[PDB]
C-alpha cells in the first residue's frame, strides 16, 4: 500500500529557527508524541529558554542552530525566508547524510494580502536541495497553523500535510513524522520540482483565512 509507513519512534528531531511560532508549534507536538526535540537558534540561551517554557516534562531542549543540526536525526528548517540560504550554506557539512525538511514559505505581504516571491532555484525546497546535495531534502508542513499547534486546547487538526521529495524512503519517514500530529495524514505530494506551488498555496490559505475567518487547512480526497 502507498499508505504504509515506517516506524519513526526514537527519531530525534532538530528544528532550526525553532524559537518562533512554527518551530515551537512543531516542537511541541513532536515532543508530546515522545520524540526528543532540539530547538535551534542563533543564540543557544534563547533556544534553551524557549524550550524550558514549551511544556513541563516534554523532552525538548535548546542549542544554537549548528548544535541542533548536529544533534537531530531529522532536521526541520523553520527560519524565515530571509535567512534560509545563509543558514543552510553554513550548515552544509553538519547536514550531510541527513533528511532535511524545509517548511519555509517565501511570501510577500502588501495592503492586498499575501503573494508568492519568485525564487531562482524554483522554490525554497529546491534552493535547499541545490545547497545540500549530500542531504535528502523533503518539503513538508507549509500549511500548518502554528497557532493551532501551540494551543493546549487543540486536540486534533484537520489537515493533510503534503510531503514532497525525490527519495521514497525520506518522504515516507516525513509522512510518518507528520502523522504524530493528531488529525494529520502525511500525503505524498510529488517530486521536489512541484514544491513551489505548495509553498505558494500558503498565500491562498491566508486569503481564505481572511475571507472565511478561519484557520484553514486542506484535505486530499479520494485517497
Q: Which of 2, 97, 133, 152 binds a second copy (CB under 8 A)?
A: 2
Is 146 labeled as ligand-binding?
yes
- Least distance between a second copy and beta carbon 184 (Å): 11
223 is a site residue for a second copy (CB under 8 A): yes
- Least distance between ligand NAP and beta carbon 7 (Å): 26
Residue recorded with cell 514549551: 54
Is 24 labeled as ligand-binding?
no
117 is a site residue for a second copy (CB under 8 A): no
Question: Cα(175)–Cα(75) distance, rounded to whole angstroms?
Answer: 14
Choose among 197, 198, 199, 195: nearest CA to 126. Answer: 195
Question: Cα(62)–Cα(18) distance, rounded to whole angstroms?
Answer: 9
Choose among 132, 114, 96: nearest CA to 200. Answer: 114
Q: Answer for the pair 15, 37: CB distance below 8 angstroms, yes or no.
A: yes
Is 198 labeled as ligand-binding?
no
Query: In the structure grid, which three cell numbers stand for residue 81, read together?
Result: 525566508
- Mark 140-179 with x for binding to a second copy (rule: CB under 8 A) and - for no binding: ------------------xx--x-x---------------
Residue 22 binds which entry of a second copy, ligand NAP, none, CB below 5-8 Å type-dependent: ligand NAP
Choose among 207, 197, 86, 66: nearest CA to 142. Answer: 197
Pick between residue 96 and residue 147 the one whose CB is nearest to ligand NAP. 147
- Least distance between a second copy and beta carbon 56 (Å): 28
List, as one string, the DSSP characters of 93-162.
TTTTTSEEEE----EEEETTEEEEPP-TTSSHHHHHHHH-TTSEEEE--TT--HHHHH-TT------EEE
Binding-site positions for NADP(+) read 19, 21-22, 41-42, 46, 79, 105, 146
Contacts to a second copy by CB under 8 A: 2-3, 112-116, 158-159, 162, 164, 187-191, 193-194, 196-198, 200-201, 203-204, 206-208, 211-223
Amino acid at each position: 500500500s502507498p499508505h504504509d509507513l515506517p516506524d519513526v519512534s526514537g527519531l530525534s528531531i532538530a528544528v532550526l529557527g525553532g524559537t518562533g511560532d512554527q518551530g515551537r508549534g512543531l516542537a511541541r507536538r513532536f515532543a508530546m508524541a515522545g520524540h526528543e526535540v532540539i530547538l535551534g537558534s542563533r543564540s543557544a540561551e534563547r533556544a534553551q529558554a524557549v524550550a524550558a517554557e514549551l511544556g513541563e516534562g516534554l523532552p525538548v531542549r535548546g542549542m544554537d542552530n549548528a548544535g541542533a543540526a548536529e544533534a537531530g536525526d531529522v532536521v526541520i528548517v523553520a527560519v524565515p525566508w530571509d535567512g534560509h540560504r545563509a543558514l543552510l550554506e553554513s550548515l552544509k557539512d553538519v547536514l550531510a547524510g541527513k533528511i532535511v525538511v524545509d517548511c519555509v514559505n517565501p511570501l510577500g505581504f502588501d495592503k492586498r494580502g499575501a503573494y508568492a516571491l519568485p525564487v531562482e532555484e524554483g522554490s525554497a525546497a529546491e534552493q535547499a536541495a541545490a545547497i545540500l546535495p549530500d542531504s535528502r531534502v523533503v518539503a513538508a508542513f507549509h500549511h500548518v497553523s502554528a497557532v493551532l499547534l501551540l494551543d493546549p486546547e487543540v486536540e486534533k487538526v484537520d489537515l493533510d500535510v503534503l510531503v514532497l521529495g525525490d527519495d521514497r524512503e525520506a518522504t515516507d519517514v516525513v509522512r510518518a513524522l507528520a502523522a504524530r500530529i493528531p488529525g494529520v495524514r502525511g500525503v505524498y505530494g510529488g517530486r521536489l520540482r512541484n514544491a513551489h506551488q505548495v509553498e505558494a498555496f500558503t498565500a491562498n490559505l491566508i486569503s481564505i483565512n481572511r475571507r472565511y475567518k478561519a484557520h484553514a487547512g486542506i484535505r486530499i480526497t479520494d485517497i
